[PDB]
């Protein structure tokens, strides 16, 4: 793979979002990655409906948690592939309420047909990432609350806790690092960004990545 990527520099990347008080990071983490694969797939950057996932996929559980891989599996199974846009079925469970499901009414942004789950392996999910874009991981991100910026090398790595979105890495760095939007606003750690160190299962990064398969 190569020494460096970053899918920013690709324009797939759309800006970084607010979850505000509401447990929806997996919501964030997935209609992310299916932002960026939609923009790769030759189509112009569009932003998707977080709000679809929180309100309406009850496999998951809206504003308590969720699963990225659940997700996707609503998406295709219960959705016919259909994810909304953004402008169609906006946020609005900032303030920790997420409003009933409404099936009338939006505008398809993206269709997905599946999703992958992406071995545990720090290597091959870079060398994915590479060739196909941005992963969605599951991370433990509690020692994230003091982050400023720099290349965190110590996380506490025990419990998946929440969800982002690989967009790069950079193996040549003095300290190799994932490159991790997270969904926090550009107001926390670099622009909205975390480097983590890459090759030591940080935040437990390799247990659970995947990315939608558009289509
Ligand atoms: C967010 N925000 C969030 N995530 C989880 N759990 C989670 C998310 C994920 F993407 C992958 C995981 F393995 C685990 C939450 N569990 C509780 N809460 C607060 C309601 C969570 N918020």
Redo the contacts with the bound molecule.
């Keep these: 793979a190569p020494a460096a990527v970053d899918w920013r520099a690709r324009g797939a990347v759309t800006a970084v979002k607010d ?1 505000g008080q509401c ?4 919501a964030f ?1 997935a209609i992310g990655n299916v932002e960026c694969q939609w923009f790769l797939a030759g189509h112009p950057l569009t932003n998707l409906s977080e709000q679809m996932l929180v309100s309406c996929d009850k496999t998951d559980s809206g ?6 891989n659940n997700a996707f599996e609503w998406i295709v199974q219960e959705n016919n592939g259909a994810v909304y846009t953004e402008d169609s079925y906006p946020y609005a469970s900032g303030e920790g309420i997420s409003p009933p499901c409404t099936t009338s009414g939006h505008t398809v942004g993206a269709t997905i047909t599946g999703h992958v789950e992406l071995p545990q392996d720090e290597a091959q999910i870079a060398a994915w990432l590479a060739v196909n874009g941005p992963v969605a991981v ?1 991370v433990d991100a509690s020692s994230w609350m003091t982050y400023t910026g720099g290349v965190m090398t110590s996380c506490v790595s025990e419990q ?4 982002v979105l690989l967009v790069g890495y950079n193996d040549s760095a003095a300290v190799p690092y994932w490159i991790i939007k997270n969904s926090w606003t550009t107001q926390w750690g670099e622009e909205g960004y975390i480097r983590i160190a890459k090759g030591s299962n940080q935040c437990l990064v390799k247990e ?1 990545a995947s990315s939608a398969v558009v289509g």
């Design positions: 979850q447990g929806s990071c997996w983490s504003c308590s948690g969720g699963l990225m599951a998946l806790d929440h969800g659970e």
